[PDB]
Design a protein around this ligand. Structure first.
Ligand SMILES: [Ca+2]
Ligand SMILES: [Ca+2]
Ligand SMILES: [Ca+2]
Ligand SMILES: [Ca+2]
Lengths: 89, 89
């Protein structure tokens, strides 16, 4: 309902069932939201960083991190992580 | 009961007899919990770090540390301790 355990801005049941971010707040997910371009997010309600990256579930879902991070890292289940490598010429 | 001497988050009489961590809260151990995959933990109620590693009994038991640590270092009786060596080729 409104209980928060991992102490982010997303309640327990919202993460357990499904939520989306609009106007910088978390709301329950409804299937009619998809055709507006919204996305369905599920996270871990006992952890503040589900993926393990420095950014928390709220920051990732609401896109409050560095704006250069790819949009496919916004869902909490995908980690924001670089794969930098070196090649010789 | 509810006394806490070493000032971790685990009560005095729980560490003496046995406890398990669920929902980030220490509870008494019942033998019916074993088939669910839970484990029985016993610690030292006069020390905040039974093994001597940097992580306390509560952090070790609840798995609230670096997620790269092996799961066999979660009971508060096995030290989280690396063994690093060098070999020449
Ligand atoms: Ca939460
Ligand atoms: Ca979470
Ligand atoms: Ca204690
Ligand atoms: Ca202790």
């Amino acid at each position: 309902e409104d209980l928060d355990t991992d102490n982010d801005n997303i309640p327990d049941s919202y993460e357990r069932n499904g939520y989306t971010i609009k106007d910088l707040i978390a709301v329950k997910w409804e299937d009619s939201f998809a055709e507006q371009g919204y996305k369905k997010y599920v996270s871990n309600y006992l952890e503040s960083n589900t993926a393990g990256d420095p950014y928390t579930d709220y920051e990732k879902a609401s896109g409050s991190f560095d704006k250069a991070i790819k949009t496919e890292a916004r869902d909490p289940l995908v980690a924001a992580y670089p794969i930098v490598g070196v090649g010789m010429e």
